RNA sequence: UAUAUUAAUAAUGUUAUGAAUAAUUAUUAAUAAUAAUAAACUAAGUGAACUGAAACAUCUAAGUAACUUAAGGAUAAGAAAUCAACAGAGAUAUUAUGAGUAUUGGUGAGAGAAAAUAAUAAAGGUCUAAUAAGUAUUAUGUGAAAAAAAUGUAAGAAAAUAGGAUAACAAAUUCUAAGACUAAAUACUAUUAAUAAGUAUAGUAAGUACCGUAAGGGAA
RNA sequence: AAUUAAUAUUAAUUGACCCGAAAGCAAACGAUCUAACUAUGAUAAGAUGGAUAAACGAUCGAACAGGUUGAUGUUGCAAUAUCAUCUGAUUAAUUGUGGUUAGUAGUGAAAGACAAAUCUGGUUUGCAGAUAGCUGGUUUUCUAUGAAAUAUAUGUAAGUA
RNA sequence: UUAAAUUAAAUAUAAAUAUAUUUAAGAUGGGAUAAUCUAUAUUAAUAAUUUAUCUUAAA
RNA sequence: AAAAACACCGCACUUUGCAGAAACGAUAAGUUUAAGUAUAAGGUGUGAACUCUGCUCCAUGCUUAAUAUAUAAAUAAAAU
RNA sequence: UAAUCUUAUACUUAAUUCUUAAGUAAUAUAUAAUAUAUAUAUAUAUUAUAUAUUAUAAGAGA
């Protein structure tokens, strides 16, 4: 039985999608800049 | 090329005897550039001459 | 020839100082290269390429079927004597450059040739080498006391 | 661990022998401190494909999108090794005409100059090179659908009594490569002022609610 | 007799009357689902048979893990469930926590199986108004005239001259 | 395992970057003592894969 | 769709002498192979064991040997 | 084979550390002279002059 694909764990989620993860890599930086340009309020977890 | 190999020389005064190459010290010879660069010139064993003031 | 991928490089013009938010810890040992370091074929920055770069063109068949290809310069790693430094200096060397060196009589001569073209077709490493050589020469000429 | 450490001193308590050693407080001196920084515009590197050709592979889209790098208030270009035609002009930039002409293309799809004359423009000329080779040139492989200038690989010149420019040669013209600087017209942003046969579903909310793990999408 | 402008028609190029693919390529995002590997932990009642007290991809059998057959369910309790039945159950076992590998592309005891409800190759942004000889749609009124479905050619026969 | 981090010239590469090597980070693991309760600081010197605990022997 | 399909233990063929072979690497350095070294490692078929595995290199490959034999780029100098 | 490639591992002076220059000592190599031993050749010792302080070893090798 599918449907329950997101299996929350705070550690994994901060480590993968978190602000610090984004800011550490060049690709991540691009993403953050993109979100800033769009004016998103929340740049990442 | 072959022609280039045959004919292209560089003029140098050797500052040391080189038995193998038959270039005795002090003498001014026209040698192949490879020879100059890879053997002679190392350790001030020779010196290029572009003109008579280089001598 | 043209030195289009050298003389087109531009570097942030320094503001002269009669402080900045971030100053470097070390001291600039070498003089700034006019044209800076190449961000194009960075393989070239390690040695003496004579302003030759990778070309990109088309492989073409008997059916005129285009397909991208690159062209590399004939680089050779080569330890060559420097009278002024009193040691052999090994570097990457386009064979053309080697030939030029041979013609001109020594690596020092090659480095220390005045023309702007020569300056252009040195790398940053080349520039550094030149600086070393000329400084050394100066030292030799002119001890502290006359 | 700058309510830092080191040094110097000053008051203080302890120990061993007025001098020596450690602890705390207080003054003076010395010694480092903190990349939040745009976006578009410009230049450069790499560089698709869908598509068009009523199929498709040459060609096309297109040196466009995209990614990457670097600079500046702008950037690039720029004072002829240029154009022209035996008469001449006189830096670039890009608008009218020239001209959809010359040129060119599986001579298909299609692509397409320059001279010249006008505008726009600013004072537009002016030395910062002891005047330029592995350079010009050649061979070969690439290279702005038309006009080269570039470039990988090897061969490789000449002194103004000389070079470059045209399939080729002969005349004749013209310019001087391998050294350089350059405002103005221009691009994009932001502000102000004006004009709207513009917008109230292009009239300020919100990049919020919400949707997705995420990039991302996205209301009323 | 031209030429210039306005107005109208037709024609070429640009998305060119409007809507609509499957696709291709570029750059990104995802391995909290899932696969394999990897590091570290944890679980496997009890009984039996073996040439060992302790050696077996051994036997019976709970937990755990499967998913054989049937019934129900099919806008369900549920975008795969329930009940019964059936299989493995010390291992090529199951499982927690973290990590690695994926978009010409990984993992795969291989089923084109899985890579976040499903892939003979994801998703998002862009090229982008791709292209569509195909389908559908194209909004007031009144007047005048009013066809064709034949021939020829066509990679042409749903088209076009 | 990860890290625009670290060796005229670490090595390689159109750019992006990739690589080995150091340094740092990284739990799911390891980490003194202690109810007859216990002191981690500063200075000076020179472990374990699994599994069984039988038989014998003694009293 | 749980099977007669994959895997398997075993059997066979083969490549590679380690500065290897295989794989990955706009391709490179370099990694896995392996702190391994032919009784190993990669690939391929078949698929425990028992009785067994006949005949055939025409063709497509591989593989060894030569001589037979053509051609591509790359050169002097010299002839119309 | 000093083509290419592979692998392993002291003082003095001048501008606390760094760099230059001079000489002297230390070690190595090359050349020259003298003394001794052996069969014109080889070995050892002494003296003079020159050069060096990326290396060494191993391997492939035009
Ligand atoms: Mg969901
Ligand atoms: Mg990751
Ligand atoms: Mg570009
Ligand atoms: Mg400028
Ligand atoms: Mg300029
Ligand atoms: Mg065009
Ligand atoms: Mg000039
Ligand atoms: Mg949600
Ligand atoms: Mg990713
Ligand atoms: Mg049991
Ligand atoms: Mg069992
Ligand atoms: Mg059974
Ligand atoms: Mg049972
Ligand atoms: Mg299953
Ligand atoms: Mg796991
Ligand atoms: Mg099938
Ligand atoms: Mg499977
Ligand atoms: Mg009628
Ligand atoms: Mg049709
Ligand atoms: Mg740590
Ligand atoms: Mg089933
Ligand atoms: Mg068998
Ligand atoms: Mg085998
Ligand atoms: Mg089979």
From Swiss-Prot, chain A:
Cell compartments where the protein resides: Mitochondrion
Coiled-coil region(s): none
UniProt GO cellular component terms: cytoplasm; mitochondrial inner membrane; mitochondrial large ribosomal subunit; mitochondrion; nucleus
GO molecular function terms attached to this record: structural constituent of ribosome
Protein's UniProt keywords contain Mitochondrion: yes
GO biological process: mitochondrial translation
Keywords recorded for this protein, A-Z: Mitochondrion, Ribonucleoprotein, Ribosomal protein, Transit peptide
Note, other: Present with 200 molecules/cell in log phase SD medium.
Quaternary data: Component of the mitochondrial large ribosomal subunit (mt-LSU). Mature yeast 74S mitochondrial ribosomes consist of a small (37S) and a large (54S) subunit. The 37S small subunit contains a 15S ribosomal RNA (15S mt-rRNA) and 34 different proteins. The 54S large subunit contains a 21S rRNA (21S mt-rRNA) and 46 different proteins.
Role noted for this protein: Component of the mitochondrial ribosome (mitoribosome), a dedicated translation machinery responsible for the synthesis of mitochondrial genome-encoded proteins, including at least some of the essential transmembrane subunits of the mitochondrial respiratory chain. The mitoribosomes are attached to the mitochondrial inner membrane and translation products are cotranslationally integrated into the membrane.
Family designation: Belongs to the bacterial ribosomal protein bL34 family.
Protein name, per record: Large ribosomal subunit protein bL34m
Gene source species: Saccharomyces cerevisiae (strain ATCC 204508 / S288c) (Baker's yeast)
Residues of the full protein shown: 61 to 105 of 105
Swiss-Prot record, chain B:
Cellular location(s): Mitochondrion
Coiled coil: none
Source superkingdom: Eukaryota
Family: Belongs to the bacterial ribosomal protein bL9 family.
UniProt subunit comment: Component of the mitochondrial large ribosomal subunit (mt-LSU). Mature yeast 74S mitochondrial ribosomes consist of a small (37S) and a large (54S) subunit. The 37S small subunit contains a 15S ribosomal RNA (15S mt-rRNA) and 34 different proteins. The 54S large subunit contains a 21S rRNA (21S mt-rRNA) and 46 different proteins.
Role noted for this protein: Component of the mitochondrial ribosome (mitoribosome), a dedicated translation machinery responsible for the synthesis of mitochondrial genome-encoded proteins, including at least some of the essential transmembrane subunits of the mitochondrial respiratory chain. The mitoribosomes are attached to the mitochondrial inner membrane and translation products are cotranslationally integrated into the membrane.
Protein name: Large ribosomal subunit protein bL9m
Organism field: Saccharomyces cerevisiae (strain ATCC 204508 / S288c) (Baker's yeast)
Protein encoded by which gene: MRPL50
UniProtKB/Swiss-Prot annotation, chain C:
A molecular function GO annotation: structural constituent of ribosome
Domain of life: Eukaryota
Keywords, alphabetical: Mitochondrion, Ribonucleoprotein, Ribosomal protein, Transit peptide
Gene Ontology BP terms: mitochondrial translation
GO CC annotations on file: mitochondrial inner membrane; mitochondrial large ribosomal subunit; mitochondrion
Entry annotated with the keyword NAD: no
Localization terms from the record: Mitochondrion
Assembly: Component of the mitochondrial large ribosomal subunit (mt-LSU). Mature yeast 74S mitochondrial ribosomes consist of a small (37S) and a large (54S) subunit. The 37S small subunit contains a 15S ribosomal RNA (15S mt-rRNA) and 34 different proteins. The 54S large subunit contains a 21S rRNA (21S mt-rRNA) and 46 different proteins.
Function per UniProt: Component of the mitochondrial ribosome (mitoribosome), a dedicated translation machinery responsible for the synthesis of mitochondrial genome-encoded proteins, including at least some of the essential transmembrane subunits of the mitochondrial respiratory chain. The mitoribosomes are attached to the mitochondrial inner membrane and translation products are cotranslationally integrated into the membrane.
Note: Present with 4000 molecules/cell in log phase SD medium.
Family to which this protein belongs: Belongs to the bacterial ribosomal protein bL28 family.
Protein name in the entry: Large ribosomal subunit protein bL28m
Source organism of this protein record: Saccharomyces cerevisiae (strain ATCC 204508 / S288c)
Residues of the full protein shown: 22 to 171 of 258
């Amino acid at each position: 039985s599918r449907g329950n694909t997101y299996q929350p764990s705070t550690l994994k989620r901060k480590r993968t999608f978190g602000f610090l993860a984004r800011a550490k890599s060049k690709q991540g930086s691009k993403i953050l800049k993109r979100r800033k340009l769009k004016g998103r309020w929340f740049l990442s977890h | 090329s072959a022609l280039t190999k045959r004919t292209h020389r560089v003029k140098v005064q050797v500052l040391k005897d080189f038995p193998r190459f038959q270039l005795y010290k002090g003498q001014v010879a026209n040698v192949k550039p490879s020879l100059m660069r890879n053997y002679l010139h190392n350790f001030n064993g020779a010196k290029y001459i572009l003109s008579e003031e280089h001598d | 020839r043209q030195w289009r991928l050298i003389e087109t490089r531009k570097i942030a013009k320094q503001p002269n100082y009669q402080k900045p938010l971030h100053m470097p810890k070390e001291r600039k040992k070498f003089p700034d290269y006019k044209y800076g370091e190449s961000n194009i074929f960075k393989q070239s920055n390690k040695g003496l390429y004579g302003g030759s770069f990778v070309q990109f063109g088309n492989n073409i068949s008997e059916s005129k079927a285009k397909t991208r290809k690159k062209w590399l310069p004939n680089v050779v790693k080569k330890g060559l004597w420097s009278e002024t430094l009193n040691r052999k200096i090994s570097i990457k060397m386009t064979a053309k450059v080697l030939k030029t060196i041979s013609k001109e009589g020594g690596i020092d001569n090659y480095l220390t040739k005045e023309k702007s073209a020569r300056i252009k077709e040195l790398g940053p490493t080349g520039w550094k080498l030149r600086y070393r050589v000329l400084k050394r020469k100066d030292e030799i000429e002119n001890p502290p006391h006359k």
